[PDB]
Structures are given as structure tokens and as C-alpha cells.
Amino acid sequence: QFNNQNNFV
């Protein structure tokens, strides 16, 4: 399981 979340502000 690959879980990936990224926020760019």
C-alpha cells in the first residue's frame, strides 16, 4: 500500500 498526499501553497 502506497499512501501519498502533498499540499503546495
Side-chain angles (χ1 to χ4, degrees):
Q1 199 190 48
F2 182 97
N3 298 307
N4 183 51
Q5 200 280 325
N6 304 273
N7 295 310
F8 302 89
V9 182

mmCIF file with all atom_site columns, all heavy atoms in Angstrom:
data_model
loop_
_atom_site.group_PDB
_atom_site.id
_atom_site.type_symbol
_atom_site.label_atom_id
_atom_site.label_alt_id
_atom_site.label_comp_id
_atom_site.label_asym_id
_atom_site.label_entity_id
_atom_site.label_seq_id
_atom_site.pdbx_PDB_ins_code
_atom_site.Cartn_x
_atom_site.Cartn_y
_atom_site.Cartn_z
_atom_site.occupancy
_atom_site.B_iso_or_equiv
_atom_site.pdbx_formal_charge
_atom_site.auth_seq_id
_atom_site.auth_comp_id
_atom_site.auth_asym_id
_atom_site.auth_atom_id
_atom_site.pdbx_PDB_model_num
ATOM 1  N N   . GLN A 1 1 ? 0.840  -1.212 0.000  1.00 0.00 ? 1 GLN A N   1
ATOM 2  C CA  . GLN A 1 1 ? 0.000  0.000  0.000  1.00 0.00 ? 1 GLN A CA  1
ATOM 3  C C   . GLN A 1 1 ? 0.872  1.257  0.000  1.00 0.00 ? 1 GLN A C   1
ATOM 4  O O   . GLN A 1 1 ? 1.598  1.507  0.980  1.00 0.00 ? 1 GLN A O   1
ATOM 5  C CB  . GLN A 1 1 ? -0.917 -0.013 1.218  1.00 0.00 ? 1 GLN A CB  1
ATOM 6  C CG  . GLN A 1 1 ? -2.133 0.903  1.113  1.00 0.00 ? 1 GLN A CG  1
ATOM 7  C CD  . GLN A 1 1 ? -2.876 1.056  2.422  1.00 0.00 ? 1 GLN A CD  1
ATOM 8  O OE1 . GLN A 1 1 ? -2.279 1.313  3.459  1.00 0.00 ? 1 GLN A OE1 1
ATOM 9  N NE2 . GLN A 1 1 ? -4.189 0.887  2.398  1.00 0.00 ? 1 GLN A NE2 1
ATOM 10 N N   . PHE A 1 2 ? 0.754  2.060  -1.043 1.00 0.00 ? 2 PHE A N   1
ATOM 11 C CA  . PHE A 1 2 ? 1.486  3.336  -1.223 1.00 0.00 ? 2 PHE A CA  1
ATOM 12 C C   . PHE A 1 2 ? 0.465  4.464  -0.942 1.00 0.00 ? 2 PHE A C   1
ATOM 13 O O   . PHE A 1 2 ? -0.511 4.546  -1.705 1.00 0.00 ? 2 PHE A O   1
ATOM 14 C CB  . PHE A 1 2 ? 2.088  3.311  -2.637 1.00 0.00 ? 2 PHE A CB  1
ATOM 15 C CG  . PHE A 1 2 ? 2.941  4.484  -3.061 1.00 0.00 ? 2 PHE A CG  1
ATOM 16 C CD1 . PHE A 1 2 ? 4.325  4.397  -2.963 1.00 0.00 ? 2 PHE A CD1 1
ATOM 17 C CD2 . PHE A 1 2 ? 2.404  5.615  -3.639 1.00 0.00 ? 2 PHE A CD2 1
ATOM 18 C CE1 . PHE A 1 2 ? 5.140  5.439  -3.406 1.00 0.00 ? 2 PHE A CE1 1
ATOM 19 C CE2 . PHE A 1 2 ? 3.213  6.664  -4.059 1.00 0.00 ? 2 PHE A CE2 1
ATOM 20 C CZ  . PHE A 1 2 ? 4.588  6.566  -3.960 1.00 0.00 ? 2 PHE A CZ  1
ATOM 21 N N   . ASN A 1 3 ? 0.658  5.260  0.123  1.00 0.00 ? 3 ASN A N   1
ATOM 22 C CA  . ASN A 1 3 ? -0.251 6.363  0.550  1.00 0.00 ? 3 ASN A CA  1
ATOM 23 C C   . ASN A 1 3 ? 0.530  7.657  0.436  1.00 0.00 ? 3 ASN A C   1
ATOM 24 O O   . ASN A 1 3 ? 1.506  7.824  1.199  1.00 0.00 ? 3 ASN A O   1
ATOM 25 C CB  . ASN A 1 3 ? -0.743 6.187  1.983  1.00 0.00 ? 3 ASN A CB  1
ATOM 26 C CG  . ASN A 1 3 ? -1.556 4.928  2.150  1.00 0.00 ? 3 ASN A CG  1
ATOM 27 O OD1 . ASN A 1 3 ? -2.517 4.690  1.413  1.00 0.00 ? 3 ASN A OD1 1
ATOM 28 N ND2 . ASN A 1 3 ? -1.094 4.043  3.005  1.00 0.00 ? 3 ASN A ND2 1
ATOM 29 N N   . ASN A 1 4 ? 0.072  8.584  -0.383 1.00 0.00 ? 4 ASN A N   1
ATOM 30 C CA  . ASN A 1 4 ? 0.898  9.751  -0.760 1.00 0.00 ? 4 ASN A CA  1
ATOM 31 C C   . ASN A 1 4 ? -0.040 10.949 -0.855 1.00 0.00 ? 4 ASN A C   1
ATOM 32 O O   . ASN A 1 4 ? -1.052 10.858 -1.584 1.00 0.00 ? 4 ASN A O   1
ATOM 33 C CB  . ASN A 1 4 ? 1.632  9.513  -2.081 1.00 0.00 ? 4 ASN A CB  1
ATOM 34 C CG  . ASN A 1 4 ? 2.550  10.645 -2.501 1.00 0.00 ? 4 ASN A CG  1
ATOM 35 O OD1 . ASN A 1 4 ? 3.381  11.113 -1.725 1.00 0.00 ? 4 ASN A OD1 1
ATOM 36 N ND2 . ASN A 1 4 ? 2.441  11.056 -3.766 1.00 0.00 ? 4 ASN A ND2 1
ATOM 37 N N   . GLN A 1 5 ? 0.242  12.004 -0.103 1.00 0.00 ? 5 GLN A N   1
ATOM 38 C CA  . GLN A 1 5 ? -0.591 13.241 -0.185 1.00 0.00 ? 5 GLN A CA  1
ATOM 39 C C   . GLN A 1 5 ? 0.359  14.430 -0.032 1.00 0.00 ? 5 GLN A C   1
ATOM 40 O O   . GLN A 1 5 ? 1.138  14.475 0.935  1.00 0.00 ? 5 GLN A O   1
ATOM 41 C CB  . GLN A 1 5 ? -1.747 13.311 0.829  1.00 0.00 ? 5 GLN A CB  1
ATOM 42 C CG  . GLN A 1 5 ? -2.868 14.291 0.475  1.00 0.00 ? 5 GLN A CG  1
ATOM 43 C CD  . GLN A 1 5 ? -2.568 15.726 0.799  1.00 0.00 ? 5 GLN A CD  1
ATOM 44 O OE1 . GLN A 1 5 ? -1.905 16.045 1.773  1.00 0.00 ? 5 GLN A OE1 1
ATOM 45 N NE2 . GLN A 1 5 ? -3.030 16.642 -0.018 1.00 0.00 ? 5 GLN A NE2 1
ATOM 46 N N   . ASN A 1 6 ? 0.252  15.427 -0.880 1.00 0.00 ? 6 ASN A N   1
ATOM 47 C CA  . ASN A 1 6 ? 1.152  16.580 -0.803 1.00 0.00 ? 6 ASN A CA  1
ATOM 48 C C   . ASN A 1 6 ? 0.341  17.837 -1.121 1.00 0.00 ? 6 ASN A C   1
ATOM 49 O O   . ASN A 1 6 ? -0.456 17.831 -2.073 1.00 0.00 ? 6 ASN A O   1
ATOM 50 C CB  . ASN A 1 6 ? 2.391  16.428 -1.705 1.00 0.00 ? 6 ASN A CB  1
ATOM 51 C CG  . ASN A 1 6 ? 3.235  15.182 -1.480 1.00 0.00 ? 6 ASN A CG  1
ATOM 52 O OD1 . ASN A 1 6 ? 4.126  15.198 -0.634 1.00 0.00 ? 6 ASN A OD1 1
ATOM 53 N ND2 . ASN A 1 6 ? 2.934  14.107 -2.186 1.00 0.00 ? 6 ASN A ND2 1
ATOM 54 N N   . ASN A 1 7 ? 0.615  18.895 -0.343 1.00 0.00 ? 7 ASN A N   1
ATOM 55 C CA  . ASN A 1 7 ? -0.037 20.215 -0.498 1.00 0.00 ? 7 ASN A CA  1
ATOM 56 C C   . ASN A 1 7 ? 1.043  21.232 -0.878 1.00 0.00 ? 7 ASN A C   1
ATOM 57 O O   . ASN A 1 7 ? 2.056  21.347 -0.157 1.00 0.00 ? 7 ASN A O   1
ATOM 58 C CB  . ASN A 1 7 ? -0.782 20.694 0.760  1.00 0.00 ? 7 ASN A CB  1
ATOM 59 C CG  . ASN A 1 7 ? -1.978 19.827 1.133  1.00 0.00 ? 7 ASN A CG  1
ATOM 60 O OD1 . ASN A 1 7 ? -2.821 19.528 0.297  1.00 0.00 ? 7 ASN A OD1 1
ATOM 61 N ND2 . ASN A 1 7 ? -2.115 19.482 2.410  1.00 0.00 ? 7 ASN A ND2 1
ATOM 62 N N   . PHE A 1 8 ? 0.825  21.992 -1.949 1.00 0.00 ? 8 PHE A N   1
ATOM 63 C CA  . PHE A 1 8 ? 1.747  23.041 -2.457 1.00 0.00 ? 8 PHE A CA  1
ATOM 64 C C   . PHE A 1 8 ? 0.933  24.333 -2.442 1.00 0.00 ? 8 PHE A C   1
ATOM 65 O O   . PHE A 1 8 ? 0.048  24.446 -3.290 1.00 0.00 ? 8 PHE A O   1
ATOM 66 C CB  . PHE A 1 8 ? 2.317  22.673 -3.836 1.00 0.00 ? 8 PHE A CB  1
ATOM 67 C CG  . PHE A 1 8 ? 3.075  21.373 -3.878 1.00 0.00 ? 8 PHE A CG  1
ATOM 68 C CD1 . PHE A 1 8 ? 2.423  20.185 -4.130 1.00 0.00 ? 8 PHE A CD1 1
ATOM 69 C CD2 . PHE A 1 8 ? 4.445  21.354 -3.681 1.00 0.00 ? 8 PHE A CD2 1
ATOM 70 C CE1 . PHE A 1 8 ? 3.122  18.989 -4.182 1.00 0.00 ? 8 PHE A CE1 1
ATOM 71 C CE2 . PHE A 1 8 ? 5.151  20.158 -3.739 1.00 0.00 ? 8 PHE A CE2 1
ATOM 72 C CZ  . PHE A 1 8 ? 4.484  18.987 -3.996 1.00 0.00 ? 8 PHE A CZ  1
ATOM 73 N N   . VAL A 1 9 ? 1.214  25.233 -1.504 1.00 0.00 ? 9 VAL A N   1
ATOM 74 C CA  . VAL A 1 9 ? 0.572  26.576 -1.400 1.00 0.00 ? 9 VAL A CA  1
ATOM 75 C C   . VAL A 1 9 ? 1.648  27.627 -1.687 1.00 0.00 ? 9 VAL A C   1
ATOM 76 O O   . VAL A 1 9 ? 2.692  27.633 -1.029 1.00 0.00 ? 9 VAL A O   1
ATOM 77 C CB  . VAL A 1 9 ? -0.060 26.824 -0.013 1.00 0.00 ? 9 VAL A CB  1
ATOM 78 C CG1 . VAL A 1 9 ? -0.759 28.178 0.057  1.00 0.00 ? 9 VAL A CG1 1
ATOM 79 C CG2 . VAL A 1 9 ? -0.982 25.699 0.416  1.00 0.00 ? 9 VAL A CG2 1
#
